Amino acid sequence: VDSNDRERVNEAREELMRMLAEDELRDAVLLVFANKQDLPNAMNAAEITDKLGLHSLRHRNWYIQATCATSGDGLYEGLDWLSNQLRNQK
Amino acid sequence: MIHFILLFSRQGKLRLQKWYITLPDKERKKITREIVQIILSRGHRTSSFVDWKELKLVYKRYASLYFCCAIENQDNELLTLEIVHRYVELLDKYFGNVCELDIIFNFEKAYFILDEFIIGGEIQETSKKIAVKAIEDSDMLQ
Amino acid sequence: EIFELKAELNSDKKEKKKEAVKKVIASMTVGKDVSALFPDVVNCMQTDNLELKKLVYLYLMNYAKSQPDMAIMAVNTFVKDCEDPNPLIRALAVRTMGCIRVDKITEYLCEPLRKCLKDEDPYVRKTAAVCVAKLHDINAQLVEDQGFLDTLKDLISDSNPMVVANAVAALSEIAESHPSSNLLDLNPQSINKLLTALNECTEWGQIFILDCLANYMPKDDREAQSICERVTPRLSHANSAVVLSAVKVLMKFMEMLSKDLDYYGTLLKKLAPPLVTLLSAEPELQYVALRNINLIVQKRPEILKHEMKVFFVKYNDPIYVKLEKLDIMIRLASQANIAQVLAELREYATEVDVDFVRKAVRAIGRCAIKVEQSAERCVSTLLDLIQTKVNYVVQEAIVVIKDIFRKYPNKYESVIATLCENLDSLDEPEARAAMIWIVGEYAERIDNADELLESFLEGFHDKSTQVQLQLLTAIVKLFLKKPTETQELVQQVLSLATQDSDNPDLRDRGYIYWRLLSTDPVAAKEVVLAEKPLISEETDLIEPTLLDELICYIGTLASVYHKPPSAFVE
C-alpha cells in the first residue's frame, strides 16, 4: 500500500478489490505490507486495514505488516508470518 | 529497407521468414501464400524482380529453396541481390557447405546470423568476416 | 536404356520379352514418353502368352493417336485374334480394336465386328455391343454403311440379359448423338421384354435397362400403371444410382398418371422412404442426392412434406452437403416445422464457416420471408444474433433485417429502437447501405435519426456509390418527414452530392432532389415519402418448361447444376 498518497489510496483499494475478485487466485493468502513507514503522516497498522476493510475478505488470510523502506524493520516478522502461513509444520 | 525476407523451398514450404513490418498474422499468412504462388508461377527468365503491391519483390534462388525480399520503391534493385549473395556466402561460411538439411534443423543459427547481419530491414555490417567473428564470439559465450 | 530395352524386346526368349513389356508399361505409367518404340514392340505382339498380349494392346491403344502411321501393322493381328476359340482373347481384341482412334484402321475393322456381332459367346456379344458404339462415335456414317443398327436392335430381342443391357446402352449412346432421325424407339412389347430382363440384369445393367424408358412417353394410364408396377420394386436396390434412376423414371411416368386413381398416392408414399434412404449414402453422393431432391421438390412438394428432421446437417458433414442442407430446409420450410427450422438455424450461427454462416443467415431470411406466421420469431432470432457481437453475423443480420423490413414493415417499429445503437462502426458495404435504408425509411421511431446520420456524412464523397445514394435518399426522407431538425442537413447533403460529387447517377439524383425541394416541398411528401406497392419476392421456383425437361435429366450433370443440358456441354 501507499499510505502517503491520499488521492491514490482509493485507486489502490479499487485495484486490490478488482484483483481480489478473480476465481483463479483463491489459494493466495493476503500479505499487506505497510511501506513508506518514515513520514509522520503514515497511519497505524489498523487505520489502513479499517479503511480498506481487510476483515471483509472472506476465505482470505490477510496480515498487515509495517516495513520501513529506509531502515528495514518489520521485514523479518513479515517473512516469518508468510513462512508460517505457507508451511503448516514444525 | 527490406520489408520482409522469406526463405521458401521449391515445393512451397518456407524455411525462413523475417518481416520488418508490423502486420496481422492472417494478413502475413495470406501475403506469404501469395508470394509463394507468384514466385512459384514464374519462369526462369523473369528478371528475378516482381512489383507486388508497390514493393519490388526480388527473388534469387541459388538452390531448390529460393529466397525473396521486399524493398521499398526508393532504393536500387541490384543492391538487394548483392545483399542476398553476401548473406548466402556468410551462411555457407559460418556452417560450412550449407545445404537444405542444415537450414530446417539449424533455423535458430540462421535467425541469429540474420539478426547480427540485417536489422530493421537495413544492413548492420558491410563486411563478411567481422560478422562471422562476432557470431562465433556470441556462440562461444555459451 | 532405350537401346537395351529394344534389344531385349527384339530377342527370342520370352523370359526377356515379358520383362521388357512390363518395363515399357511401367515407364509409361511413370510418365515417360515411350511412343518412340511403338514400331519396336509391334513385332512382339502375336504371342501365345495372354499376360503379354494385354500389355501390347494397352500400349497400342495408348500409342495410337500419337503414331497413327505406325499403327497400320496391327490390323492383321486383330483379324487373326478375332477368331480364337478362347472368349477372353476375342473379347480383348474386340475391345482394343474400338479403342484405337485411327481413321485408316476403323474402315477394315467392320468385318470382325460383323462376325462377332452374332457370336454365341455372351462375353463376345457384350464386347461387340460396346465396340459398335465406339466405332460409331468415331465414324457415324461408317456404322450406318456397315448396317449395325439392325443388328443392334435384335440384340434387345435376345437372351443373355447382360448382353441385352449392353446393347441397350450402346443404342442409347448412338441415339443420343443422333439427330433424332430414325429413332430406335419401340412399342410396349419391347418395353415389356426389357422389364422381363430388368429383374435379371446386373447392378450396372439395371441403369441401362432403366435409362431407355427415360425417352419413351406413355399414352394411357393402364400402360403407365403397369410400368410403375415394375418400376416400384427398384426402390429397394442397394445401388444408390439404381434407386435414383428408378425415382427419375417414376417421376417421368407420373406426368401421365391420374391423381384421381389410388396409384398416385401409393407412388408418392412409396418414394419418400427411398429419398430418405438416399440421404444416408456416401458423402460424395450426398450432393447428388440433395440436387435431385431440390429438382424434385419444385415439382411435387407433397411427397417429402413431413421429412424435415432428416434434413438436419451433421457435425461431420462436408461443406458441399452443409450448403445444400440449408437450401433443402428452406425449400421444405413451413409453419408446421417453423420452430424446428429456427432452432436448427440458431445452432448453425455458432459455427466457424464464414460461408456457412452467410448461408445460414440467408436461409433464415428466406424462411422469414416465405412464412409470415413466424416473422416475429425470425426478428427475435436476428436481434439475439446481433446481440452476440459477431462481425460476419452482424453484417448478415443487417441485410436480413433490411430485407424483412421491406416486406413486412407494418409492425417492425419495435425493433428499430434496439437497432439504433448497434455498433454502426461496421464497414461492410452490404450492411451500411441496409442500415441507412432502414434508418431513412423508419425515421419515425428513432428520435435521434439526424444525429446518427452525421457519422455517415463525414466520408460520403468517398464511401461508395450505393452507400452515397442510400445516404442521399435517407437524408431526403428525413428532411421531408421532419424538416425542423434536418433543415441544414438537407442543404449540406445537396452541396456535398451536387458540387463535390462526380457520380453521374449520384449527381443526377442530387440534382433531382434539389429541384424537387426548391419546386414544391409539400408535393415531396406524396412524391418521395409515398407508399410503395407490395414488393414481388424473387421466386426460387424454376420455370415449368425447364423443370419438365429437367425431370427427364435425372442423375446427370444437368441435374446437379440445375442448368440445361445444352447450356453446359461443349
Next chain:
Amino acid sequence: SASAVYVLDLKGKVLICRNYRGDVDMSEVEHFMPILMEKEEEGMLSPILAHGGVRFMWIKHNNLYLVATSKKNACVSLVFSFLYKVVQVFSEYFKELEEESIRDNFVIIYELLDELMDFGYPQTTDSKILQEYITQEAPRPPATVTNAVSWRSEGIKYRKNEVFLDVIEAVNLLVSANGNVLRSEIVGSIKMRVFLSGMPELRLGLNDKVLFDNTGRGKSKSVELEDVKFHQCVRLSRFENDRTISFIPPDGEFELMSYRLNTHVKPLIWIESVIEKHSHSRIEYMVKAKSQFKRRSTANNVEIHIPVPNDADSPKFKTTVGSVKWVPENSEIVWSVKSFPGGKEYLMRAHFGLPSVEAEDKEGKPPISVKFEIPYFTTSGIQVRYLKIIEKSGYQALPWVRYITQNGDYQLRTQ
C-alpha cells in the same frame, strides 16, 4: 459416361490412368490439382470439378483421389457408383488402399481396369466373380457373368454348410444443446458370411410389421422398418409381391439387407455434461453418463468423447468408473469405459488449465460423441424368424447369426 478413369496421389502425380473414350486430352489432369487448390482455399471445393467443358467428378480415397474426367452430360451418379465399385474391388484384391500397391500391382490393376468398364460403361463389378478371370499370380470367363446369377459361382463345395449372420445395429442420435434429441434414427444392417455348397436359395423370414399385418399377426413385437434395402441377390419382385425375401447368398461376407427406421424411444445412454469454463482461468466438466438401456446388457468399450479446450493443458480427471485419457491429437476428453452395465451411472469432474492470453480465432463446439457397443442387444426388437436354405442336391444347413448393438451418429450437441 466417364471419359478417363485415373488414379491421383497426394502430391498431384497420376498413379494410374485408363481412358475409356479418348474424348478428353490426357493433359487435362494437370489442371485438376490447381483447380482443387483454388476451390479448397475459397470454400467452393466440390467432388465434381469443371475444367472448361470438361468436368472432374471424383471421390477422395485414403491416399488417392479417384478422378474420372468427362465431357458430355454423363450420369454423375453412375460415375460415383463405378468409383465406389472400383474402391470395393481394390479393397477386396489388395488389403490396403495406399500408394504402396498402385506402383506395385500395375500388372493386375491394368487388367482389372480394362475388364471392369468399356467405353465408359462398367459391365462386371463382382469381386468374387472377377477373381476367377483376372489374377495377379487366363482361362475362359466363368458362366456366372453370362448367366443371370452373377453373384454366386456354381460348383462351390464345402465340407460343412455354415452361414454366419451379423445383425449389427446403428444407434444414431442428434441431441440438441437444449437437451432434446432431434435426429434419432436406427439403421439395421444384416451382414452375412455365407459358406455353403452349391447355389442355395435362402428364404429369409423376420418378424416384420408388414408381414405380421398381412398374416394377421399385427399384435406382437414387430419391427417397423421404414426403409428396407436388399442386396442384388434379393429378388425385388418377390419382396414387393408378398414381402417374400428369397435370394441366393454369395460366397463370403456381404450385405444382404440394410434396414433403416426411426426410433421414438429414450436414448440408451443419457449424458448430462456441464462446462464451468472460467474466463481464461479454468474450466469444469460435470459430465454424468446415465445408461437407460436394459440392465441385462453390457456395452463393451464405451467411449464417450468429450471435446475439451483445444489449448487446454495440465488436465485433471475426477471420475467414478473407467479410464479418462486426454488425446491432444483429437483435442477431446476420451471417456473410455470397458464394461458399462445397463442402468449404471458414472460421474466425472474434469478440471484443466487455460492460458491467460486469449485465442486469435474461434474454435467452435464439436459435439460429444459416444462410442458404445453393446453386444446381444436389439433395440428395434427385430428378431430373425426363419432362413429357408433350399438346395437341389439336398443338405442340412446350420444357420447362425448374432446381434450387435453399437453407436452410429451418436453425437450430442454442446452448449
Next chain:
Amino acid sequence: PIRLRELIRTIRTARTQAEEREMIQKECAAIRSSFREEDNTYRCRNVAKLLYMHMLGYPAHFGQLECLKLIASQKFTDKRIGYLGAMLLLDERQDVHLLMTNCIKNDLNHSTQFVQGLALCTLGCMGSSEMCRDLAGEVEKLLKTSNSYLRKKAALCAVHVIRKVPELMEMFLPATKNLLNEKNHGVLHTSVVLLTEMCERSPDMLAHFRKLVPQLVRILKNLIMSGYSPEHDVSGISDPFLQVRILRLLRILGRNDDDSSEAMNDILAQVATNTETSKNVGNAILYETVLTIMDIKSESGLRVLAINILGRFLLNNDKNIRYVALTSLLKTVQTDHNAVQRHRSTIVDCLKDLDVSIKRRAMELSFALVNGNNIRGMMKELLYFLDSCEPEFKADCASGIFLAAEKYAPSKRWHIDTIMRVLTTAGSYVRDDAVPNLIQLITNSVEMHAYTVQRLYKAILGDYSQQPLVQVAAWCIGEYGDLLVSGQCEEEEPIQVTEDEVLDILESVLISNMSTSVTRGYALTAIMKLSTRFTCTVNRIKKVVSIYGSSIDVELQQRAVEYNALFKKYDHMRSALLERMPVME
C-alpha cells in the same frame, strides 16, 4: 524435453496435413504442460519447438508469457531464445509487448556486449509507437559511445525509432554530429543510413547536414581509390554496400542546390567512367550513380554520360539489367525528357518481351513518355498492345490509355473515338471508377454529341454485358436523347434510330440478368429523363416504371416509386426538374 532436431525429424515424417496437425499437437500439448509447470531447465527446447510450430502455421499465442519470462532470465541461451521469440511472435499489435520495455531497459545497461546487442536488435526489429517513447533516452546514450560493435546497432535503433517516431528526430541531431570519421565500414554505413533517413524525414536538417558534403565526397573518393581490401571486397568491388549508401546520400542531397551539386560533380564523373560493371555490383553502382545524377542539378556533361550508360544497359540481354534500365528511364521521365525519346524503338520492343516485369516497365515507360506530338502515333501501338495484352495487363492498359487521352488529347473527336474503341475492346477490364471520369469528359464537351450518341447506340445494341460500356451508353442516351433522334415525334422514314429500340434496350438492360444494380440505376435514370427529352414515345415508359416499382432492390424500388409518383401525379412538373446538369472540371 525433446530437442529441436528430434522434433524436426518427426515432423519430416508427417505425410498428410491432417496427420501432421495431430503430430504437431502431440508436441504442443507437452509444451503447454511443461510451460504450465513453470519449467526453467528445458525451457529453451520448448521455446524452439513452439517457434518451429508457429512458423509451421500453427497457433502459438499461449507461448507469449513464457517468452517474457525467458527475456528477464539470466542464462544466455534462454535470453537468446526469448529474444528470438519476441522478434518472431511479438509485434506492435500483440498488446503483450508493453511489459517487455522493462526487460529491454534492464538489458540495455548490461555489461555483456551480446545481451545488449540482442536487446537492441529486438527493439529495432519490433519497435512500437510507445516503446520508443520510453526508450529514446537510453538509445542516445549508447549512440555516443566508442563501441564499434555497438555503434552500428545504436544507429539502426535510432533510425528505427525515427521511422516509428518522426517527432523524436530532434534528440538525435546533437548525437550524430562529427561522426563521419569512423574507420570501420559498418559504423560509417550506419551513420550514412541515419543521415539519409534524417534528411528524408525533415528538410530542417538538410542545411545542417549539407555542410558535411565534402567529407562524404572525400570518403567516397578514398573508398574508390582503395580498390583492394580483404573485407567488403566482393567481385573486385570495394564496399558496394557503402558505395550504394554514399550514392543515395549524394542523390538525396543537393537536389535543389547548386553548391552541393557542383561539389559532388567530380566524384560522379570519376565514378561514371572508372567503375567496372562486369559483375552485378558494378551494374548496381552505375544504376545508383545514374539515379543520383538524374535527381540532382549536375553538369550538362554528366547527363550525356548517364544517357550513354542507360542506352548501353538497355541493350543488355540480362533481364535484371533491362528492368533496372526501365526503372531508371521511368524515374528520369520528366527530367531530360528530350533525350529519352531516342529509345522509342527499344521501349516498344520491350512490350513484346516474355517478362512480366519487363513488359510492365515498358508499358509504364511508354505511358509516361506520351507527349503532345507522339500521341497520335503511339495510340495505334497502345491499341494493338491492349488487344494482345495479358489478362492482368488489359485493365492497366485501358486505364493508362484513358489517362493519356484526358491529359494531352490532340482533339476531342479523336479522344472520343479512342475512348469508345477502348470501351468496346476492354469490356470486363475497364475499372468502374473510370466511368465517372468518362461521364465528366462527355459532359464537358458540348460540340460533339450526335456522333458520340450514334456510336454509343451502335455499340450498345450489339452487346450489353459490359458494365462500364453499358453505364457510359446509358448516361450518354439520358444526356443526349434530343440528338440521337431528331424530329421523331411521329412515324417517319426508316432511320437508324426509331424512338422505339432505345426504350426496348433500356427495358432489356433493366430486365437483363447481367446487371450489377448499378447499370440498372443508370438505365432507370435515363428512362426517367427520356420523358421530357423525348416526346414522341410518351406514356409508354410510365407503365414499365409502375411495373418496375415492385422490384426486389430497395434502392431500385425507391427509384421506381419516385419515378411513378412523378409520372402519375406530377405530369406537369416533370419537365420542371429535368434540366441538364452543370459541367465542371
Next chain:
Amino acid sequence: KGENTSLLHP
C-alpha cells in the same frame, strides 16, 4: 532429393 546440394557450391 535435391536438398543436400550446397547453396552456392564454394
Next chain:
Amino acid sequence: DRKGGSYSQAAGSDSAQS
C-alpha cells in the same frame, strides 16, 4: 466366444404360419 454377442442358430421358416 466373440465380441458383440454370441452367434445364435436361426430357424428355417415361419413354422407357426404353415
